Design an enzyme around this catalytic site. Structure first.
Site, short mmCIF file in Angstrom:
data_model
loop_
_atom_site.label_atom_id
_atom_site.label_comp_id
_atom_site.label_asym_id
_atom_site.label_seq_id
_atom_site.Cartn_x
_atom_site.Cartn_y
_atom_site.Cartn_z
N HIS B 41 -0.50 7.61 0.90
CA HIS B 41 -1.85 7.66 1.01
C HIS B 41 -2.92 6.99 0.52
CE1 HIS B 41 -1.50 8.95 -3.26
NE2 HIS B 41 -2.12 8.20 -3.69
N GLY B 143 -5.24 6.23 -10.13
CA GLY B 143 -5.22 4.61 -10.22
C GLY B 143 -3.65 5.11 -10.74
N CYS B 145 -1.33 5.80 -9.08
CA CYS B 145 -0.38 6.25 -8.35
C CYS B 145 0.75 5.20 -8.00
CB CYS B 145 -0.84 7.01 -6.87
SG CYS B 145 -1.82 8.22 -6.82
#
Ligand SMILES: O=C(Nc1cncc2ccccc12)[C@@H]1CCOc2ccc(Cl)cc21
Ligand SMILES: O=C(Nc1cncc2ccccc12)[C@@H]1CCOc2ccc(Cl)cc21
Lengths: 304, 304
Positions: B41, B143, B145
């Site tokens: 993503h 943030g 991820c």
């Protein structure tokens, strides 16, 4: 979202751990620049620990008696000295992995991360608080001595604790990096009173603010209190008296949630008097006191 | 003595963290050898996340669009591919800090350490369990991820989790290092049922053994039970059914304490039916299920 008992990343400290052996005793040392720091009881046998005269025991030791190994490589010891309850072993090589560092003496109620080590090898990392009675409730086995506690601000490791001893009660005692014990403890195998401990009120309030930020709000009530009224309750429940300095430290969390500090005190008062009634806050069925207001803001803001 | 929610030392993983930016999105990547792994993503804008066609979104991207930075140094991307929900960015330089590693898919009820990162920088480390419903109760902000979960056996890091998403319920979802989600989750901003969670029975029993080892024994009783009787109680209290495989895993702890597994089951049965009565076990007022039998033996034996 989510709130965990988070430790600092231990990498910078892992690079400093070494094994120190003296005679038949092996423990951990901290290698910063050209000095290895370790608990002075490395020079003792188990028999010596009942009433050790460290000055006399150290006199029988020479540089070549302190075996310092960083991983599989041996360090050459060119000097030794005792500072309070630590030994400082001067080595001929500066640790290439020395981070930017400071030695600090933390206050009771502050938190830090511990890198538990055995034979100079890191086994795990955990977060804890220095209790108001200057003990820490750690997780330490035989051989863990010399494992250190620390905080990290960007690239600087502030070392605050070196592990020395487990009291007969199962709690832990240690020193700052200048070898000064936190609390009344002495490095001797003798029963030692830790003294009355209290709950870190400012930290419980910080954690209640963390709960509100992370969605747990069931404990919020329609009440308020005063510092004086709250402190009568704190006295009854063995909580540290809350001061205006504590209120001031809680300012950022009060602004973030819009809940005045004395209103959060009234929620804490009700929780102390009524209990949790089988409910939980942030996965805990008791009031947590191991997160400072700074920890809550750091964890809820993502400081690296 | 003492028992803590201990994480593995994070140093070996810290050396693998990088920042990955694609367009206006920045997240964390894991640099092992000459490949950077990150959540797919990273190629999405916030608008794309409602119903992303990742194949189409990735087609509009070239090697030069993925900005990978390790500390302050930029990595040159020479290839990109999508494997399930992860992107694999081939770089021209092998990470000099790559530890010995494996990619593993953990089972529900197993534990691991998480190194929470932001902009490729480590912020903290914590221990957690993969829930029986394949979510983790982590501590993650925007943030985070690409932050990873792992276990360490001597010098080998077994990576098991990469963080992808926070569900509207505040719990977390992610993938193995091959990009396969744990659980029914999809990388889309859509409400997703996590499904019924249960308490990890074998882990609670392991933690009760840890309590006995570390001095907390008040919950031990004069009773025993059978697997069938215990499982009737486990059903009522939303605990996983205990099997002979679980009993077998608990063997080492049963031998260490001399308390037969079914006798410890009877203590757990009484605790489930009567509660704690205002008492605590290892500093907790609830039954802890985030320590596996292996964790208890490791922490109580000092494996490095
Ligand atoms: O406490 C000590 N070691 C340990 C430290 N932390 C956890 C332990 C767990 C289990 C066994 C030992 C442990 C040593 C040995 C005992 O006599 C003393 C007396 C004073 C001092 Cl400074 C140190 C020691
Ligand atoms: O969840 C996501 N990010 C976060 C991850 N962990 C903790 C967060 C805390 C606060 C805000 C964002 C967080 C992103 C953004 C939202 O839309 C989606 C949808 C699907 C996927 Cl795979 C990722 C994401």
């Amino acid at each position: 979202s989510g709130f965990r008992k988070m430790a600092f990343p231990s990498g910078k400290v892992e690079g400093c751990m070494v094994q120190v052996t003296c005679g038949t005793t092996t423990l951990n040392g901290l290698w910063l620049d050209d000095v290895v720091y370790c608990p002075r009881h490395v020079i003792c046998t188990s028999e010596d620990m009942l009433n050790p005269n460290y000055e006399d025991l150290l006199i029988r030791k020479s540089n070549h008696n302190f075996l310092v190994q960083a991983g599989n490589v041996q360090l050459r010891v060119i000097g030794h000295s005792m500072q309070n309850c630590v030994l400082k072993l001067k080595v001929d090589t500066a640790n290439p992995k020395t981070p930017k560092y400071k030695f600090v003496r933390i206050q009771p109620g502050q938190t830090f991360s511990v890198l538990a080590c055995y034979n100079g090898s890191p086994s795990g990392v955990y977060q804890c608080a220095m209790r108001p009675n200057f003990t820490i409730k750690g997780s330490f086995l035989n051989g863990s001595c010399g494992s250190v506690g620390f905080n990290i601000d960007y690239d600087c490791v502030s070392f605050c604790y070196m592990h020395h001893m487990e009291l007969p009660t199962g709690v832990h005692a240690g020193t700052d990096l200048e070898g000064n014990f936190y609390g009344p403890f002495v490095d001797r195998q003798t029963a030692q009173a830790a003294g009355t401990d209290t709950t870190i009120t400012v930290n419980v309030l910080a954690w209640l603010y963390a709960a509100v930020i992370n969605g747990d709000r069931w404990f919020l009530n329609r009440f308020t209190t005063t510092l004086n009224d709250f402190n009568l309750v704190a006295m009854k429940y063995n909580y540290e008296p809350l001061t205006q300095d504590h209120v001031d430290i809680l300012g950022p969390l009060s602004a973030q949630t819009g809940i005045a500090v004395l209103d959060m005190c009234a929620s804490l008062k009700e929780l102390l008097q009524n209990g949790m009634n089988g409910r939980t806050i942030l996965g805990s069925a008791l009031l947590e006191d191991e997160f400072t207001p700074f920890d809550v803001v750091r964890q809820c803001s993502g400081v690296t």
